[PDB]
């Protein structure tokens, strides 16, 4: 099998505008996330510009709710992990520690986030001070419960802030403040030892707060009486290599807790996953039980540092045996490596590392299907194609870089300006899509929210056809059919990609009658040979091909291809839950997931039909199969042409036919996501050649109602 491929996405690729038409500036990425509420609406927030910008936008399009930019007067006072955002009492509670000694409370009514009909000025902020934070240093903020937070200090000490009136905080002192957390020991290369500079914590039973300090001693404090109950020295000189060691002093995630299973990262080696169970023993004392330790060896050049770690339920992301998946986001430099330690069993001793394959739609299309932008002739066409592939945010930013570095724009005349642009569109999209954080979208599907607002990269599960395709770059086989397709790929890597598309073009004419349907199909295949394969074909490969054909039964292989490998699953409305609102994020990714799949089929269909062009063979029994592949070839190619015409209008027709509601959907499970793509794919193949649902919409919108010459011209 293969591995998870991501999808690049922008929410400003649907809109030809730079920025939301509904925005408001209010005035009182480091981390970003998206929070599912019990309203069942996703609201996204990003924390960027070195703590001087909170960006809230609904993840349901920022042009049907108000963008609210809450511009902070000050940057945060040590760390960018002194932010907690959770929904409290049907108001979105935002807590911010600021550099001036204040504690910021914002109350954003849910109505103001998701309606654009709502501007609000006044009663959206209250700034008040529990204890001056320009004195003793906060480095961590944790929201504990719905009326309790603990702000952990860098010189040790626990300060609870208790909630009054559903908004404001009043300080409640605990007796455990530093001065004497340094009078019960000595030490001389240490000073963090009994100071509670807690770098990660998670709360079990809403009673006991399991805290990891800088030293990564796991200390369990029952905070329903503010007593230390248990102390485990976790660091060891034989569960880990002490020669290899790196300091961790930065607030992030080093404890992960899902169900009662805890994961502790030990800063000895280049990480240790120590797996244990949290169980309460008699006398109401939570005890930690070691189970197993897994050593590991990384590979850097400036030391991999973790970002986040999230223990969750079994994920289907090209696994083979699973009990739990521990997602790990490493970053050193501008490389992020997403890898997933899949533990397959309860022992935790059989594991595999499932790697992330970080190839979008963009990379596979640049690698193979290179003539598609400004390489299809017409500079006017090239220019629109650049817009559609990389959104408004990248597009406008690219104009800025052009002005600094002085490039004279000669758009719509010179092919070479489009190449210059194309390069920039790429460097700016990569910077914008870099990893910041993990968010679980729907509590399963691994979403990386990225630097700068309105940027996300979702990863998807590859289906049987998709797994095979990456296993032709490994040349892995496993049926009679799989072997046939692998041979055909060998021959096609020798032909230029330009010839492969010329042969695709002539197969299309057979369905359109632009090559007459007055010939036998065999004569038309002869036309193809002479025009496209002369002085390109390898003589060697023709014979190898003949030997494979003699070993594998033809009609059998062709039925198998058509009915199980190109065609999608049979799933319809009932397999998926339908949303009660519009959502942009889901409809975009579905489009692109459908698109990807059909691009591989477009090439498969090409490669199989080619054999009939090489040799002069009877197609009186195989004629029935052949007709299907020309039909399938058609539909696959058609969608591609339309996507360049305009990808947004093409999504709108599609969403209606699938959805009960029409427009948008929500996903919370991998089965659901899959079914919905399969339902769209079915709908396309159920369409006729003569009238398409797309053809009708696109024509009416541009051509009849009348729009400027650019939409008329590529539509031609």
Curated annotation (Swiss-Prot):
Residues 106-127 are annotated as: Leucine-zipper 1. Residues 265-286 are annotated as: Leucine-zipper 2. The modification Phosphothreonine is found at residue 392. Keywords: Coiled coil, Membrane, mRNA transport, Nuclear pore complex, Nucleus, Phosphoprotein, Protein transport, Translocation, Transport. It is a peripheral membrane protein. One of its GO terms (molecular function) is identical protein binding. Functions as a component of the nuclear pore complex (NPC). NPC components, collectively referred to as nucleoporins (NUPs), can play the role of both NPC structural components and of docking or interaction partners for transiently associated nuclear transport factors. NUP120 is involved in nuclear poly(A)+ RNA and pre-ribosome export, in GSP1 nuclear import, in NPC assembly and distribution, as well as in nuclear envelope organization. Component of the nuclear pore complex (NPC). NPC constitutes the exclusive means of nucleocytoplasmic transport. NPCs allow the passive diffusion of ions and small molecules and the active, nuclear transport receptor-mediated bidirectional transport of macromolecules such as proteins, RNAs, ribonucleoparticles (RNPs), and ribosomal subunits across the nuclear envelope. Due to its 8-fold rotational symmetry, all subunits are present with 8 copies or multiples thereof. This is Nucleoporin NUP120. It comes from Saccharomyces cerevisiae (strain ATCC 204508 / S288c).
């Amino acid at each position: 099998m293969a591995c998870l491929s991501r999808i690049d996405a922008n929410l400003l690729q649907y809109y030809e505008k730079p920025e939301p038409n509904n925005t408001v500036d209010l005035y009182v990425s480091e981390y970003s996330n998206c929070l599912l509420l019990s309203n069942s609406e996703y609201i996204c927030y990003h924390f960027s510009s070195r703590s001087t910008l909170l960006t809230f936008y609904p993840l349901s399009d920022a042009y049907h709710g108000k963008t609210i930019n809450i511009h902070l007067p000050n940057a945060s006072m040590n760390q960018r992990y002194t932010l907690t955002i959770q929904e409290v009492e049907q108001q979105l509670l935002v807590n911010v520690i600021l550099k001036d000694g204040s504690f910021l409370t914002l109350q954003l009514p849910l109505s103001f986030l998701f309606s654009s009909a709502n501007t609000l000025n006044g009663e959206w902020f209250h700034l008040q001070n529990p204890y001056d934070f320009t004195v003793r240093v906060p480095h961590f903020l944790f929201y504990v419960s719905p009326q309790f937070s603990v702000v952990f200090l860098e010189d040790g000490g626990l300060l609870g802030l208790k909630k009054v009136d559903g908004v404001h905080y009043e300080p409640l002192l605990f007796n455990d403040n530093s001065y004497l957390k340094s009078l019960t020991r000595f030490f001389s290369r240490s000073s963090k030892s009994d100071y509670d500079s807690v770098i990660s914590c998670k709360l079990f039973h809403e009673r006991y707060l399991i805290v990891l300090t800088q030293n990564c001693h796991l200390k369990i404090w029952d905070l329903t009486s503010f007593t230390l109950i248990q102390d485990y020295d976790m660091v060891s000189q034989s569960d880990s290599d002490p020669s290899h060691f790196r300091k961790v002093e930065a607030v992030g995630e080093y404890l992960s807790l899902y169900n009662n299973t805890l994961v502790t990262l030990l800063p000895l080696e280049n990480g240790l996953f120590q797996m244990g169970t949290l169980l309460v023993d008699s006398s109401g004392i939570l005890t930690y039980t070691f189970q197993n330790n897994i050593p590991t060896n990384l590979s850097a050049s400036a030391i991999w540092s973790i970002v986040d770690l999230v223990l969750t339920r079994p994920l289907e992301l090209n696994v083979e045996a699973s009990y739990l998946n521990l997602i790990v986001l490493w970053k050193s430099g501008t490389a992020s490596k997403l890898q997933i330690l899949n533990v397959n069993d309860e022992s935790f001793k059989n594991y595999e590392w499932i790697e992330s394959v970080n190839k979008s739609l963009v990379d596979l299309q640049s690698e193979h299907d290179l003539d598609i932008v400004t390489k299809t002739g017409d500079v006017e066409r090239g220019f629109c194609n650049l817009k559609s592939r990389y959104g408004t945010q990248i597009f406008e930013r690219a104009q800025q870089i052009l002005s600094e570095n002085k490039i004279i724009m000669a758009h719509n005349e010179d092919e070479e300006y489009l190449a210059n642009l194309e390069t920039i569109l790429r460097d700016v999209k990569t910077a914008f899509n870099e990893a910041s954080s993990i968010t679980l979208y729907g509590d399963e599907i691994i979403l990386v929210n990225c630097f700068q607002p309105y940027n996300h990269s979702l990863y998807k599960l590859n289906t049987t056809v998709e797994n095979w395709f990456y296993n032709m770059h490994s040349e892995t086989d496993g049926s009679e059919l799989f072997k046939y397709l692998r041979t055909l790929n060998g021959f096609a890597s020798t032909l230029s990609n330009d010839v492969l598309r010329s042969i695709s073009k002539k197969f299309l004419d057979i369905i359109t009658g632009e090559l007459p349907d007055s010939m036998t199909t065999v004569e038309k295949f002869t036309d193809i040979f002479k025009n496209c394969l002369e002085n390109q074909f390898e003589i060697t490969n023709l014979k190898i091909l003949f030997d494979e054909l003699n070993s594998f039964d033809i009609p059998v292989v062709l039925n198998d291809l058509i009915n199980n490998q190109m065609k999608p699953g049979i799933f319809w409305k009932k397999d998926f839950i339908s949303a009660i609102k519009f959502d942009g994020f889901t409809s975009i990714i579905s489009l692109e997931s459908l698109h990807q799949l059909l691009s591989i089929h477009y090439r498969i269909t090409l490669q199989v039909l080619l054999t009939f062009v090489l040799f002069d063979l009877d197609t009186e029994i195989f004629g029935q199969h052949i007709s299907t592949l020309l039909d399938l070839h058609y539909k696959q190619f058609l969608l591609l042409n339309l996507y360049r015409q305009d990808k947004c209008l093409l999504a709108e027709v599609l969403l209606k036919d699938s959805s009960e509601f029409s427009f948008g959907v929500k996903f919370f499970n991998y089965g659901q996501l899959i079914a919905y793509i399969d339902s769209l794919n079915s709908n396309v193949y159920n369409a006729s050649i003569t009238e398409n649902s797309f053809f009708m919409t696109f024509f009416r919108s541009y051509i009849i109602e009348n729009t400027s010459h650019k939409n008329i011209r590529f539509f031609l």
